[PDB]
């Protein structure tokens, strides 16, 4: 239950390297096994910690467990599940990040919907924060995952001005709600994303930290370069031009947040999908993770459980599918 007096940049160094429990509690279904992953167990999390990951990111989708307004009650048994997994990590001496994940349908960043969204968000964050209020500073809240207007031309390009404005307002509501619960929540580290967790320059330039809160960490995601990492249209990686382009991405993030803004950064998702390309995936993981570590940015690999996609740990057998990726990230 202890809260250190600790600056965000040292806290982020202490977070080490992380791993996402993807397609689990974040599954967009009332049944969190619907996306193909078993119910999470401590035995699973134990292997994540034994491999040397220091941070578990525990993405959670809340939509199917939130009741009607104006109270928007979160089901107690859902909180129980979240808490249990969090404790699996904390018992392993890990940091744990809990977020709001695939909840965009009630978090649409438009002026039209803002007023209702801000009402619901305040109620939901109050509830999550009160459940977890007595936990110490190894538990971190991440207010929103990739808040954006899905299906729009600027969705993955940093949004429109209206969308970035609304996203900033939703972070404002969420931080305020967390801090108003008091206790350890007045001091807890909060990860606050850009629009979409984008690294687009407009998203970088328009980002606002609510109240200038000194315990806010910046959250961005960068599956760089996307042609290799996401689309599978390029399956090779490792030229000097590839290296230079990735370092330029990372230097953009460093220059804006770390140097100009005096903020620490968690790269709360990155990684590459499997494209019949193990050697280049490994080279890219090694280089990316090293580049983040040299900059003081905490890298958190996205693992969705699916070996044909982002899964590097086998949750059903407790073995690593791709142990060398894992090792390249944590060394």
62 near 78, Cβ under 8 Å?
Answer: yes
Question: What's the domain count of the chain?
Answer: 1
Residue 230 belongs to what domain range? Answer: 1-331
Task: Give dist(CA 55, CA 46) in Å, integer.
Answer: 12
**Are the CB atoms for 316 and 325 separated by under 8 Å?**
no
Question: How many Cβ atoms from other residues are within 10 Å of residue 213's Cβ?
Answer: 15
Q: Indicate the annotated binding residues.
A: 234, 236, 242
Cα dihedral angle (322, 324, 330, 331), rounded to 10 degrees?
A: 170
Distance CA 263, CA 257 (A): 5
**CB-based burial label for 321 (10 Å; 0-12, 13-18, 19+):** middle
Is residue 75 a contact partner of residue 65, using CB atoms and an 8 Å limit? yes
Please write down the HEC assignment for all residues of the chain: CCCCCCCHHHHHHHCCCEEECCCCCCCCCCCCCCCCCCCCCHHHHHHHHHHCCCEEEECCCCHHHECCCCCCCECHHHHHHHHHHHHHHHCCCCEEEEECCCCHHHCCCCHHHHHHHHHHHHHHHHHHHHHCCCCCCCEEEECCCCCCCCCCCCCCCCCCHHHHHHHHHHHHHHHHHHHHCCHHHHCCCEEEECHHHCCCHHHHHHCCCHHHCCCEEEEEECCCCHHHHHHCCCCCCCCHHHHHHHHHHHHHHHHHHHHHCCCCEEEEEECCCCCCCHHHHHHHHHHHHHHHHHHCCEEEECCCCCCCCCCCECCCCCCECCHHHHHHHHC
**Span between the terminal Cα atoms of the chain, in Å:** 29
Return the closest-CA partner of residue 146 out of 135, 157, 136: 157
Query: For residue 291, what are the β-bridge partners?
Result: none
- Which residues are annotated binding-site positions for Mg(2+)? 234, 236, 242
Contacts of 114 (CB under 8 A, 6+ apart): 166, 169, 170
Stated resolution in angstroms: 2.0
The catalytic site residues sit at: 146, 269
Q: What is the dihedral of CA 129, 300, 272, 323, to 10 degrees?
A: -120
Name the β-bridge partners of 187.
Answer: none
CATH number of the domain encompassing residue 315: 3.20.20.80
How far is it, in rounded angstroms, from Cα 172 to Cα 209?
Answer: 8
Structure tokens at 272: 């590459």
Query: Nearest-5° angle of CA 60, CA 173, CA 74?
Result: 40
CA distances from 310 to 19, 237, 246, 279 (A): 11, 17, 19, 15
Do 191 and 266 meet the contact criterion of CB atoms below 8 Å apart? Answer: yes
């Amino acid at each position: 239950g202890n809260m250190r007096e600790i600056a965000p940049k040292e806290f982020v160094l202490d977070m080490g390297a992380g791993w996402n429990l993807g397609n689990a509690m974040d599954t967009y279904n009332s049944d969190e096994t619907a996306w193909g992953n078993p119910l999470t167990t401590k035995a699973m999390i134990d292997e994540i910690a034994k491999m040397g990951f220091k941070t578990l990111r525990l993405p959670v989708t809340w939509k199917f467990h939130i009741g009607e307004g104006p109270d928007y009650l979160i089901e107690a048994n859902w909180l129980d599940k979240v808490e249990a997994i969090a404790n699996f990590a904390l018992e392993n001496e890990m940091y744990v990040i809990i977020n709001i994940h695939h909840d965009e349908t009630w978090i649409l960043p438009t002026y039209e919907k803002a007023d209702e969204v801000k009402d619901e968000l305040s109620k939901v964050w109050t509830q999550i924060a009160n459940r977890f209020k007595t936990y110490g500073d190894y538990l971190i809240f991440e207010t929103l995952n990739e808040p954006r207007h899905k299906g729009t031309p600027e969705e993955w390009k940093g949004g429109t001005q209206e969308g970035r404005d609304a996203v900033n307002q939703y972070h404002q509501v969420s931080v305020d709600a967390i801090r108003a619960t008091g206790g350890n929540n007045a001091k807890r580290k909060i990860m606050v994303s850009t629009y979409a967790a984008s690294t687009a320059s407009n998203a970088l330039n328009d980002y606002l930290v609510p109240n200038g809160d000194k315990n806010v960490i910046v959250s961005v995601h960068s599956y760089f370069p996307y042609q290799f990492c996401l689309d599978g249209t390029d399956s090779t990686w490792g030229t000097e031009a590839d290296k230079t382009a990735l370092l330029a991405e990372l230097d953009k993030i460093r220059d804006k947040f770390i140097v100009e803004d005096n903020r620490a950064v968690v790269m709360g998702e990155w990684g590459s999908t499997f494209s019949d390309n193990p050697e280049d995936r490994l080279a890219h993981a090694e280089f990316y993770a090293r580049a983040c570590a040299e900059r003081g940015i905490c890298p958190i690999w996205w693992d969705n459980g699916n070996v044909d996609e982002f899964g590097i740990f086998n949750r059903n057998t407790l073995e690593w599918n791709y142990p060398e990726i894992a090792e390249a990230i944590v060394k």
